[PDB]
Design a protein around this ligand. Structure first.
Ligand SMILES: *[C@@H]1O[C@H](CO)[C@@H](O[C@@H]2O[C@H](CO)[C@@H](O)[C@H](O)[C@H]2NC(C)=O)[C@H](O)[C@H]1NC(C)=O
Ligand SMILES: *[C@@H]1O[C@H](CO)[C@@H](O)[C@H](O)[C@H]1NC(C)=O
Ligand SMILES: [Cl-]
Length: 219
């Protein structure tokens, strides 16, 4: 996250740290006791919930999981289309003060331009920079459709540099308490704008289908 502020422990209790061999590479959100929502672009990884400082064990706060299955709905890498993925955890996460579920918008809900949201993550402060050991967050504003695309929800900041960066991909965009977006991409210098998030409301019905039909799918 660029142009943000250090979060306090448990400030964003739904946050997920997706790691590869213990290295954080993407963010996500717990949207169900058994599922974490992230970006398809991000994809033996593990999912870490309840984390604060990436470099600390935090045994009494963290919950770690293996991914039992992954689901996507027409993801297209070339067009950055439908960049959304659901990771089924190896078991149910326990809901604690440090691990909570982030509610979703109803199918087709909208967020008008100018709506205030927040985005939090462990991403870097500049392209190619180091990750942030603590979670950081920034206030963002939904942009005019004209600056975005139907498949996404776009935001910007008032400052010259603020928004997502390396490692924030997959982290949720939270507006009016709901996960309206999934960090997908941003072009040029991080914070320049606008940030592109997959529009979650477009996938509500599909997500529901996944949540209600747990399992690895056809074998
Ligand atoms: C997120 O935006 C909120 C809303 O403007 C910011 O909160 C304000 O901060 C200023 C300066 O610290 C205060 O004078 C106001 O009282 C605050 N408003 C409320 C009632 O909290 C907040 O600091 C922004 N956070 C970041 C990460 O941008
Ligand atoms: C959501 O909008 C699409 C596209 O306009 C429409 O075809 C679909 O029926 C809507 N879903 C519901 C639940 O309203
Ligand atoms: Cl809604």
């Amino acid at each position: 996250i660029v142009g943000g502020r250090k979060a306090r422990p448990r400030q964003f209790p739904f946050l997920a740290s997706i790691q590869n061999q213990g290295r954080h590479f993407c963010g996500g959100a717990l949207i169900h006791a058994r599922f974490v929502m992230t970006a398809a672009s991000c994809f033996v990884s593990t999912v870490v919930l309840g984390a604060y400082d990436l470099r600390r064990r935090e045994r009494q706060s963290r919950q770690t999981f293996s991914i039992s299955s992954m689901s996507e709905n027409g993801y297209d890498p070339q067009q950055n289309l439908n960049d959304l993925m659901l990771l089924q955890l190896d078991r149910e996460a326990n809901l604690t003060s440090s691990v909570t579920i982030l509610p979703l918008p109803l199918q087709n809900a909208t967020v008008e331009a100018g709506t205030r949201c927040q985005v939090a993550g462990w991403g870097s402060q500049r392209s190619g920079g180091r990750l942030s050991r603590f979670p950081r967050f920034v206030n963002v504003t939904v942009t005019p459709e004209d600056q975005c695309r139907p498949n996404n929800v776009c935001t910007g900041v008032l400052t010259r540099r603020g928004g997502i960066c390396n490692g924030d991909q997959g982290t949720p965009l939270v507006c009016e308490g709901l996960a309206h977006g999934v960090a997908s991409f941003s072009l040029g210098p991080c914070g320049r704008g606008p940030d592109f998030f997959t529009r979650v409301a477009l996938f509500r019905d599909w997500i529901d289908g996944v949540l209600n039909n747990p399992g690895p799918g056809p074998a």
